[PDB]
Design a protein around this ligand. Structure first.
Ligand SMILES: Nc1ncnc2c1ncn2[C@@H]1O[C@H](COP(=O)(O)OP(=O)(O)NP(=O)(O)O)[C@@H](O)[C@H]1O
Ligand SMILES: Nc1ncnc2c1ncn2[C@@H]1O[C@H](COP(=O)(O)OP(=O)(O)NP(=O)(O)O)[C@@H](O)[C@H]1O
Ligand SMILES: C[C@](O)(CC(=O)O)C(=O)O
Ligand SMILES: C[C@](O)(CC(=O)O)C(=O)O
Ligand SMILES: O=C(O)CC[C@H](O)C(=O)O
Ligand SMILES: O=C(O)CC[C@H](O)C(=O)O
Ligand SMILES: [Cl-]
Ligand SMILES: [Mg+2]
Ligand SMILES: [Mg+2]
Ligand SMILES: [Mg+2]
Ligand SMILES: [Mg+2]
Ligand SMILES: [Mg+2]
Ligand SMILES: [Mg+2]
Lengths: 456, 105, 456, 105
């Protein structure tokens, strides 16, 4: 019937790593829960759409080895949200296999719950027709065509599926796509700790030491929930929590810091306080949670084309000064030479050193002494992308721009080959709320992991 | 003399808020500084829009978050994260125009 | 010989393209030969090493369609050197297949000679032991291990193999790796035109309108050889040949403009003059050739690892000012997290906007307002490269550098996914002369190309 | 009287001469100007070496090609074309230090 609940978040995204000494010091604090976020939409739609991880298998395995060994040894649950980077079926399976390998190598046995977040297209089609879909801010209205042309569709689960898995005795809970705070908050809430404090603590812990200062995406943090607030601490003498660092992480990646919405309710933070306590720790209080009619956020992406790219520098001041017109003239030349006639062939330039990061919103209008010219072509087939990219590359290389004096070639390529096929390109196609229903219930199942695998 | 935003702020940054929105966060060094800026009424949509080469109506919200001595500027992403033609998939390096801000106080 | 010999060079490298109108105008001048270079070592060792073209199949096919239709229609030979970009067996076959398709689509029948340039490793090993190999300037001495670990080895042929194929009636001559001037000079020399003038003409024409001004890698040029010199012209009113443009092309890509070595001799240009004639044309005279003991240049490459890369910009002035130290700290962090202890992992950064093009030779020591950060890792396996690249990317993304104020992330990625697996990396391993021998003779084979394929 | 190279040169450029060598070509608009530069003896290995951050002995040759009113500077590539770590595989954008040259006539 303990009056505190201690949560260890080892790293901002499972796979990003952390210092072994930080993790060891955190375990000396005897957490009640080891929890981590394993995924995000911020790396863009490729990862969900193609079924691929944005994290590295060796890094995820390295990080999980510490976590699972520690949780099993000390009888501390380990809870993971958005398995495998994006939390669809292939991502969940990818992370599951890593865990089996750890159990074989470390000679461990433990129960593991798997909670898939995949949503069949038929459910989404039916919900659209029944008026149960709502676009988030600035998102286009959903159509049947967008649903059908998406690949994996996932819903961000809340606390309740994790709670059911934990109540069934799972020692490791491997969740598919999940609302990042829920990973952290599910267990303390079911043990009676305050929902507002637990979800706000989870929102500050979901990126581990990004909420500390100096920040790190690869260092540990702990939150300790008590009856009146929660305390945040790091485990690296070079890092600490401050009122600013903790409050900044309350704003992080949110549209409105007063109201953080998620499945089942909204965190209302107008009463929050941040107080520096002890040495390098912060006590947070006043967070409130308000229930709302239950809805889930769906994510999906669709393939839009295929990309080929090239990168090269220029050091010539005449070429740099005239670069915008040069690129237009090269494009015109290539279209004429290859008789291009498809507006779906899209050539994009990034001029690093002038406006590569901000594009038309860049305030500085002049380059310095060097540009990095990144070109990419997205086209309906890989062959077309490759062909247009190649001709842009060779045309730009030898283009006779006005007043040119460096007449043997215009580009410094760092690599052989100069052109790189990068493959299918995805765009987000679903970013919409769906009203909860029986059909959308998240089921878990528990498997008994052993050093020999899972039996039968 | 004017007071630069950099002289008053500990954090000046951008990030996505999902694939469709860009948020700019400014956390001030002291509550007094935050209140001075808020009272001045100088951190306006017109100011931000001019700095970012957008129309003032493109700024969706400016949110004064008192618990953190922080202000959040919200605008739509004019290229959805990861769309063809994007410059910054995570929305992480769009803060530089704010570094030019100076307040007349 | 008598009066003149007109050579049309349509483009700098077969596949780079040219304006249809320029080609039409050039044909109205009634060439005696359509000749083109199809390859180069300048794009680096990947293309020979991996057996791949640096040019685009669609571009090559487009350019050859104009050339072969015109040559067959008007009974003008078409001669191609370094087929397929690098001129080894796979490159030659790739170009051969393109030509078969053109004959099928245009309903053409013609004889085509193929001249391979591949050299068996056994020949090179034997030559090394027999003292018949000479390194070119600054080239390391050749070893047996370097020979054995090379992939495709090719020799640059001279004029004589082309001449034997033409004498046998070939209407299209598709040469493997070749000395660039030779595919232009072989025919006029066999018709009695002076060897020195014809080879110098070929050297000036080998990149078509790169030798004109404003230059283009994608526009036509003609040389008209007479018994006292040669005249150079373009076929685009916006381009001209001038004394400077033609003389510049005599210097182009050579280490001594007075003496240009190739198979069978050296061009001596001590006595040459360049003189403007007509309107936008140049007359070149005085070139001479000195025979030398016959030797061939060999080229080869070897695989050195696998590459994974990422590109992202930064717009923050504090990050930019501190970037060199930040990158070192990120490397140290990744090596500790992944327990890296292979000196065969190589991490390279290019900082576009500071010193991406010139490296340690860049005179400017400060960046401007933006950097393009290109990272590449080369390692013994793709998996290792991918893992290191991924961890460097995520560590750099969230690294808490001193005085940071932009604390939500450090990098603007243009793409999803952020990391690009570029695959095998090659380096040059052979760049050496070999004494000619019977085993190194370049033999032609003629096939009859028809609208239904090759007919015997 | 200081006179810039850029005011005299029609061409100032770099390219590979094979994978192991970098060549810099300077071609003058007039024979008069070429000869003035040549006879001045001011375009030395030491000048070029300083501009490129190499030792003077790294410059292999400076060749005065009278028929073209041109001078060619030859040096080894300190990174073989296409080797791991390269910056410019074709050797095409290494000319910029020459743009600072001023003669004294
Ligand atoms: N049920 C819901 N109702 C409303 N909005 C929701 C709901 N579920 C998710 N969202 C929105 O989606 C966001 C999900 O945030 P989070 O779970 O932190 O995502 P993430 O992509 O995994 N972030 P991170 O890994 O930190 O980069 C919330 O901030 C809301 O904007
Ligand atoms: N037999 C030989 N003896 C000496 N040097 C040779 C010989 N053959 C080739 N070379 C050298 O290799 C170079 C080949 O030049 P070239 O044929 O123009 O090559 P390339 O790589 O096809 N050029 P490009 O297509 O214009 O980029 C010559 O300049 C010489 O330096
Ligand atoms: C992907 C990620 O690293 C996740 C996070 O917010 O921690 C980012 O969005 O920057
Ligand atoms: C590959 C190429 O385009 C060939 C040429 O010299 O024309 C180059 O070396 O720049
Ligand atoms: O809308 C804006 O002002 C900028 C968002 C932009 O789309 C981005 O690529 O980050
Ligand atoms: O050797 C030099 O001075 C510079 C050559 C450099 O290696 C390159 O990458 O072009
Ligand atoms: Cl005031
Ligand atoms: Mg997440
Ligand atoms: Mg994020
Ligand atoms: Mg999150
Ligand atoms: Mg060539
Ligand atoms: Mg070349
Ligand atoms: Mg050549």
């Amino acid at each position: 019937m303990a009056r505190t609940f201690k949560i260890l978040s080892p790293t901002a995204i499972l796979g990003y790593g952390f210092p072994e000494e930080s993790f060891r010091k955190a375990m000396e604090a005897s957490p009640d829960l080891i929890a981590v976020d394993a995924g995000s939409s911020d790396p863009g739609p490729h990862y969900l759409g193609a079924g691929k991880p944005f994290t590295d298998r060796a890094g995820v395995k390295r990080d999980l080895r510490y976590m699972i060994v520690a949780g099993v040894k000390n009888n501390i649950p380990v809870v993971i949200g958005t398995a495998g980077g994006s939390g669809a079926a292939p991502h969940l399976e990818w992370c599951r296999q890593i865990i089996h390998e750890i159990a074989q190598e470390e000679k461990l046995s433990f129960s593991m719950a798997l909670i898939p977040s995949d949503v069949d297209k038929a459910i989404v089609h039916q919900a659209l027709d029944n008026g149960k879909i709502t676009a988030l801010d600035f998102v286009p209205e959903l159509t049947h065509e967008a649903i059908e042309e998406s690949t994996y569709i996932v819903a961000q689960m809340g606390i309740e599926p994790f709670q059911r898995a934990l109540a069934a005795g799972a020692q490791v809970v491997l969740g598919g796509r999940a609302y990042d705070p829920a990973c952290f908050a599910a267990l303390p809430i079911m043990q009676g700790f305050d929902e507002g404090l637990a979800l706000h603590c989870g929102k500050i812990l979901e990126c581990a030491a990004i909420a500390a200062t100096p920040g790190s995406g690869s260092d540990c943090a702990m939150g300790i929930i008590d009856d009146s607030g929660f305390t945040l601490k790091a485990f690296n003498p070079k890092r600490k929590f401050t009122e600013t660092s903790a409050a900044a992480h309350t704003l992080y990646e949110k549209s409105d810091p007063y109201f953080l919405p998620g499945p089942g309710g909204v965190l209302n933070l107008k009463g929050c306080t941040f107080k520096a306590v002890n040495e390098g720790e912060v006590y947070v209080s006043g967070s409130r949670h308000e229930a709302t009619p239950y809805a889930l956020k769906l994510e999906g992406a669709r393939r839009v084309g295929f990309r080929c790219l090239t990168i090269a520098g220029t050091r010539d001041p005449i070429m740099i000064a005239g670069i915008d017109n040069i690129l237009e003239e090269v494009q015109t030349s290539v279209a004429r030479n290859l008789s291009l006639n498809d507006d779906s062939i899209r050539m994009t330039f990034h001029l690093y050193g002038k406006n590569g990061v901000m594009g038309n919103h860049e305030p500085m209008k002049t380059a310095g002494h060097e540009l990095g010219i990144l070109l990419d072509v997205v086209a309906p087939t890989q062959d077309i992308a490759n062909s247009v990219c190649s001709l842009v590359r060779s045309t730009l290389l030898h283009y006779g721009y006005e007043n040119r004096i460096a007449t043997a070639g215009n580009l410094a390529f760092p690599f052989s080959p100069s052109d790189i096929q990068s493959g299918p390109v995805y765009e987000f196609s679903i970013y919409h709320l769906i009203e909860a229903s029986d059909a959308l219930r998240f089921d878990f199942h528990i498997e008994q992991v052993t050093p020999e695998g899972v039996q039968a | 003399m004017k007071q630069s935003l950099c002289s008053l702020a500990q954090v000046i940054r951008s990030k996505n808020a999902g694939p469709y929105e860009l948020v700019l966060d400014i956390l001030f060094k002291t509550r007094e500084d935050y209140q001075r800026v808020k009272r001045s009424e100088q951190l306006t949509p017109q100011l931000i829009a001019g700095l970012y080469n957008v129309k003032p109506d493109f700024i969706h919200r400016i949110i004064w978050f008192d618990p953190a001595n922080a202000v959040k500027i919200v605008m739509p992403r004019d290229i959805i994260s990861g769309n063809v033609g994007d410059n910054d998939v995570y929305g992480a390096q769009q803060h530089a125009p704010l570094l030019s801000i100076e307040f007349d106080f």
